[PDB]
Structures are given as C-alpha cells and as structure tokens.
Amino acid sequence: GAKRLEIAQVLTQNAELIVSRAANRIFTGGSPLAFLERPEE
Amino acid sequence: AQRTWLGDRLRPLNSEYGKVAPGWGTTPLMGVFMGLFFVFLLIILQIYNSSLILENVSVDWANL
Amino acid sequence: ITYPIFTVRWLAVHTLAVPTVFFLGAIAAMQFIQR
Amino acid sequence: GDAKLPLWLIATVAGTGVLVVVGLFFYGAYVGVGSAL
Amino acid sequence: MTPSLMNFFYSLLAGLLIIVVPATVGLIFISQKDKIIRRS
Amino acid sequence: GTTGERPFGDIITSVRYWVIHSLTIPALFIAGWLFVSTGLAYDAFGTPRPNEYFTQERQELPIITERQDSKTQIQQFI
Amino acid sequence: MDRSRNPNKQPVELNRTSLYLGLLLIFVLGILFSSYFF
Amino acid sequence: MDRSRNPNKQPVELNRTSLYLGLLLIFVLGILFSSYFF
Amino acid sequence: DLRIVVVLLPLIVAGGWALFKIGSAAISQAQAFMK
Amino acid sequence: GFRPINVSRYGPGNMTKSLRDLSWFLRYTTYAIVAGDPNIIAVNVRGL
Amino acid sequence: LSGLLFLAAVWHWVYWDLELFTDPRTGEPALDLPKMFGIHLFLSGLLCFGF
Amino acid sequence: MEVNDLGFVASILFVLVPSVFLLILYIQTQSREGKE
Amino acid sequence: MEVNDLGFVASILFVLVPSVFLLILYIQTQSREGKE
Amino acid sequence: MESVAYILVLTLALGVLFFAIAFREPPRIG
Amino acid sequence: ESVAYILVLTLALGVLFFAIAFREPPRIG
Ligand code: CLA
Ligand SMILES: CCCCCCCCCCCCCCCC(=O)OC[C@H](COP(=O)(O)OC[C@@H](O)CO)OC(=O)CCCCCCCCCCCCCCC
Ligand SMILES: CCCCCCCCCCCCCCCC(=O)OC[C@H](COP(=O)(O)OC[C@@H](O)CO)OC(=O)CCCCCCCCCCCCCCC
Ligand SMILES: CCCCCCCCCCCCO[C@@H]1O[C@H](CO)[C@@H](O[C@H]2O[C@H](CO)[C@@H](O)[C@H](O)[C@H]2O)[C@H](O)[C@H]1O
Known part of the structure; x- marks a missing residue:
C-alpha cells in the first residue's frame, strides 16, 4: 500500500496533463483541456 | 450564428482558441533564432556602413 | 539591530x-599647471 | 559601536570641503592655460 | 579572412566574453544563493 | 518604511566609516593629481600638450581628410 | 444570408466645453499654417 | 435681471431619406454651376 | 612606462586599507546566505 | 474506419460531457489502484 | 479593384456572426491569433517566393 | 488652359457648406430616435 | 502681389472640415438630453 | 485648375446614387 | 489672398467670446 499510494501520488498531479495528451489525438478544432469543467477547490 | 458554405471550410482553422503548449515551451529555439537574427542584422548594418568591408564588395556606385 | 555591510x-x-573624487583630484590639479 | 558624532558638525567640513574644490576652480579661470594670460 | 571582418569578429568574441557571461553567471550565481522564502 | 539595510544617517554616525575614509578619499584624490602632473593623460588619452599643437612643418590646423584609413594620417600629423 | 441587429455601437459624447478646445485648436492651426500655404 | 428656462424650442427631425434628397440636390447644383464658376 | 606605476600606487593603498580595517566583518558577511 | 472528430461539428454542450469523462476514466483508475482491486473499473465500464 | 474591394467592404458590415468568429466553448466572438499567424505568413511566404 | 482662378474656391463651398449643414441635421435626429 | 494660387483652397478646408467634424459631434451629443 | 473639380462633384453625386439604393430605410406597415 | 487671415483670425477671436458667455456652468453635486 505504500507503493500503491505512490502510484496515485504520481497520477494525481499529472492527471491535468494526461487528458491533454489524450484528447489531442481525438479532437482537432479546439484546444480542449481549457474546455474541461474541472471541479473547483 | 449563420452557417455559410464559406464558414464551414474555415471553422476548423478557427475551431480552437486557447489551446496552448505546456510550461515554458519552445522558448529557447525562438531565442537562438533571435540571436542568429540580431547577429545577421548586425552584419548587414556594417556591410552598408563599410565597417565590415570585405574583398570584392565595394559598397559604392560601381555596381550592377 | 545588525545590517549587512555590502549590498547592491x-x-x-x-x-x-570612485570616479568622482578621482576626477575631482584630476580637475583640482590641472589648474596649477600652466602653458 | 557607540562612537556616533553629530552629523551637523561633519555637515560643515564636508560642505566646506565641497566649497574649497569649487572655489579652486574659480581660482583656475584666472591663472593657467585657459586664462588668456 | 579579411582584416575588417576579423576586427569585427573579435568584438563578437569580446562583447560576448566580457558583457554577457559576466552578466549571466554574475546574476544567476547570486540569485540562486539568496533564494526568497515562500513559506512565510 | 524600512528597506532592510542600514540608513545613511546611521552610516556616517558610525566612526568605523571614517577610519576607512580618513586615508581613502584623500588617496583617491591624490591619484587624480598624479594622472595629470605626470602627464599620463596627455599620453593615454589623446590630448595634445600645450606646446605641441603646431610643429615647424605644420601650421595648418589639422583635420582628418579621409575616413577609410584614418590611422597613418594622425601619425603623419604627429 | 439574413440580417440582424447589432449588440454594439456605443454613441459619442463630445462635450460643450470640449467643442471649444477643438474649435480653438483648429483655428490656431489655421492662423499658423495659412501663411505657409501662401 | 435673472435668468430662466425656455418653455419653447422644439427640435428638428430631418429624416434619413430626406438627407438623400438634400444631398443629391446640392450635388446636381454642384455639377450644374461649377462650369459657370470657371 | 614607469609613470603608470606611480599613479596606481594610491589606487592600491586605497584597497590596501580596505583589507585591514573592515574585512574581518566582510568574511562573516561572505559567510552569509550559506554560500 | 476511425477519423478524429471536429469540435465544431460535435457541439460545445455535447463535448462538455465528453471531456469530463476522460478525466473520469483515470480518476477511477487512480481509485482502483489504492483500492487494490480492479473491480470498480471492471463494473462501471461494462456496457458504457 | 477598389470598387470590388468596397462592394465586399459593405458585405461584412451588414452580415456578422457568420459561425466563424466565435469559439465552440461559448458564443462570445473571439478569434485565434497564433494559428492564424501561421496561415497569414505562409501566404506571404508563398508570395515573396513568387516575387 | 484658362480658368477663372476662383471657381475651385467657389464650387467647393457651394457643395460642402449646405451639405454639411444637411449632414449636421441628420445626426441629431438619429440621437433623438435612440432616446438616450 | 504674388501668391501660391491654391492656399485659399487649402486653408479653407484645413479650417472647416475638422471643425464641422467637431460641430457634428457636439450637436450629436447635446440633442441626446432634451426629453424626447 | 479645373479638371479634377468636375470629376470630384460628379463621383460624389454618383456615390449618393449608390447609397440611397442600398441604405434606404425599411418602410414598416401600420 | 490677404483676407484669409482676417477670416480665420476673427473666428479665433470669435470663439474667445463664445467661451466666456456660453460656458457650461459647473454645478456642485
Ligand atoms: C523578410 C522580409 C522582407 C524584406 C526585408 C524585404 C525587402 C525589400 N522588399 Mg520585399 N517583400 C516581402 C518581404 C520582404 N521584402 C514579401 C513577403 C513580399 C510579398 C508581399 C514582398 C513584396 C515586395 C514588393 C512587391 C516590393 C518589395 C520591395 C522591397 C525592397 C524595398 C522595401 C523595403 O525596404 O522593405 C523592408 C522591409 C522590412 C525591413 C520588413 C521586415 C519586417 C521584420 C521581419 C520585422 C521584425 C524586425 C524585428 C522587430 C527587429 C528585432 C530583431 C532583433 C534585433 C531582436 C526591399 C529589397 C519593393 C521594391 O521597390 O524593391 C524591389 C517592391 O517593389 N518587396
Ligand atoms: C479625411 C478627413 C480628415 C478629417 C480630419 C479631422 C481631424 C479631427 C481632429 C480633431 C481634434 C480636435 C481636438 C478635440 C479636443 C477635445 O476633444 O476635447 C478635450 C478632450 C476631453 O476628453 P475627455 O476625457 O473629457 O472626454 C470627454 C468627451 O466628451 C470628449 O470627447 O481631451 C482630448 O481629447 C485631448 C486631446 C486634444 C486636446 C487638445 C487641447 C490642446 C489645444 C488647446 C487649444 C489650442 C490653443 C493654443 C493657444 C496658442
Ligand atoms: C450663410 C449660410 C448659407 C448656408 C446655405 C444652406 C442652404 C440649405 C439648403 C438645403 C436644401 C436641402 C433640401 C432638403 C430636402 C428635404 O428636406 O427633404 C424633403 C422634405 C421632406 O419634408 P417632410 O414634410 O417629409 O418633413 C420631414 C422632415 O424630416 C424634413 O425635415 O421636403 C422638402 O423639404 C421639400 C423641399 C425640398 C425638396 C427638394 C427635392 C427636389 C430635388 C430632388 C433632388 C434633385 C435631383 C435632380 C435630378 C436631375
Ligand atoms: C555619489 C554620492 C555619494 C554621497 C552620498 C552621501 C549622500 C547622503 C547624505 C547624508 C544623508 C542626509 O542626511 C540626513 O540628515 C538628517 C538630519 O536631519 C538625518 O536625520 C537624522 O537625525 C537624527 C540624527 O541626529 C536622528 O535622530 C534621526 O532619526 C535621523 O533621521 C537623516 O536621516 C539623513 O537622511
């Protein structure tokens, strides 16, 4: 579980970048991550 | 919001607006193309002043 | 209390x-010399 | 340090130190290489 | 090589070597020593 | 308000400033005295001496005729 | 293909006293430059 | 001796299409009379 | 070129007084910011 | 037979459900990693 | 040409919001400038190489 | 070619100063229409 | 007496056509208040 | 001189011939 | 040729008169 938290502790701060890697291959006309309605603090 | 035949061929050229490269980006590629460009501007300013005069240039009215 | 000596x-x-009183010593000496 | 001395006193001797080095220049217009003498 | 090109080329040596690298090393190797504090 | 460093009326009030300025600002003053009493500024900077304007072969108020070379002419102008 | 109405075009608000500044400024440029046009 | 406010001064109402008639009428008088001023 | 030698001799006694009289506190200020 | 879809033909109200799913596909992946069992991925995806 | 420029100049004054000037994220009029700089200058890059 | 030397003064004030009189009076109506 | 033959065209359009521009915009503005 | 004085007032009359056709106000029925 | 100044000078003097009589009176609020 100490290793399993470290996998989440690499993915949680990298999740905002990883959708911009993901959505940029399936979407063309607009820079999509800005269209993401992220949950606010 | 009026669709034309014109505007359905350029809306993929103007579909996105704030899509942006990540943090600090391709800045120093643009920096080293700038520093090559300022040196190129500094060379041609003294080609024309005859202060980096070379052989067989002779910036003068003896020309073609 | 305590302040640093050297700063910007x-x-x-x-x-x-430093180029003032070195020049002020320059100009105060040139009137004593003559043609 | 506690060796502080009244500024006003050294306001004089820096001020007349300024006064003698601009008073020497107006002496220098009247003898020397630019005086036409 | 021409005697006015290399007299210009020694400037691009020296205008680099005196002005630029003692600005860059002369800024970033003192700002990285005196780092500001963000923890308040 | 404050800046972080020592104020100016706290500097000159300190006697440690004047031990390093009883022998230094006269020392930089006398170094300017020797820059011209030895005549080094005549040689290092290009100033003509006040006997060496006009020579026996030259009374004709020197100017630089040609921009292109401009370095053997001053040595010809002495 | 079909017209609409603008959600735009704010009007202009040149004041009474600001007319006097602009009318004077053209007339000093009138009495300055008319000699040079002759 | 003392001022007041007018119970008067109706404003003017020159139409958009009536501008076109007046602008055309001056311009046909422009192209008519400019030969005679020369 | 002996005359350049005598004119920098007040330049080097300028900094030569700067060594002995303050500089014990300067190395402690050079000990500052952990570098 | 796949082509990448354009946003202008798709719709902004149609894609605002789309882009939050892409975070949600990995948000439940980060949930399942610390949960130690991939059951929550393998039960909220069947027939999606 | 300036007559054919002026007749095209009066066309865009009466017709705006031609589905090209807004983002899909909301309906406010806003146009992408750096993607358009790549298509302005590529036409000027073609036209200098022609010249 | 001969010319009267002053018609270009005359037929530039004959055309403008009644038309900018007329161009003054159309704008005011537009403001009134607006109700501002 | 000599003259440039065209300054009276030039310095009658230099003074008028910005001032009747300015005289358009005051009567633009002042007619908005007045309770239509 | 005079030759541009005719062509000015001609094409300024012709400009209103374009403007009154296109920018006529719409008549509304009531 | 000569009455083009005295045209435009008296318009410059005329606007000096109209700024003294017909100024906007500044009302305190
Ligand atoms: C690289 C750009 C460039 C440059 C330098 C020139 C230069 C020239 N053209 Mg030209 N031209 C170009 C592009 C360029 N052209 C293109 C793309 C077209 C097609 C539209 C034309 C079409 C054209 C025609 C039709 C004609 C010319 C003419 C001319 C000549 C005179 C006009 C002049 O001085 O322009 C100088 C222009 C510039 C200096 C603009 C450069 C803008 C730069 C990129 C701005 C960036 C500088 C930057 C802010 C500085 C900081 C850098 C660094 C210090 C950090 C000259 C030889 C005319 C002529 O009479 O000669 C035959 C002529 O008839 N050209
Ligand atoms: C092809 C067609 C060509 C047409 C050309 C038309 C040109 C138009 C140029 C008009 C300029 C008119 C200036 C308007 C003036 C004006 O608009 O009022 C003053 C104006 C007031 O601005 P505010 O912020 O108060 O805005 C309130 C609004 O009502 C103003 O519109 O301030 C300025 O505009 C500053 C710039 C002009 C300041 C000029 C004052 C200095 C000169 C003083 C007078 C000279 C006396 C000299 C004594 C020797
Ligand atoms: C010292 C200063 C000198 C300054 C001089 C200023 C002079 C001003 C003179 C302006 C007159 C402008 C006319 C306005 C015209 C105008 O105001 O619009 C038409 C106008 C409409 O009146 P209405 O009853 O509709 O009123 C509605 C209001 O909005 C009008 O103000 O009817 C008339 O005024 C009739 C008289 C003019 C009719 C003229 C039409 C005939 C000519 C047609 C065009 C010619 C084509 C010829 C083809 C070959
Ligand atoms: C090239 C330039 C090099 C020259 C540099 C020298 C410039 C500085 C000049 C000296 C500074 C001016 O000196 C100014 O004197 C006043 C006296 O009213 C001081 O005022 C001081 O008064 C007394 C000291 O007895 C204290 O109680 C007080 O707290 C303090 O403010 C100011 O703090 C100082 O700003």
Missing part, C-alpha cells in the same frame, strides 16, 4: 563616487 547600493553609490 554599496555598489550603486561607489560607482559615480
């Missing part, structure tokens, strides 16, 4: 004062 302003005030 120690270099800001010495520049245009």
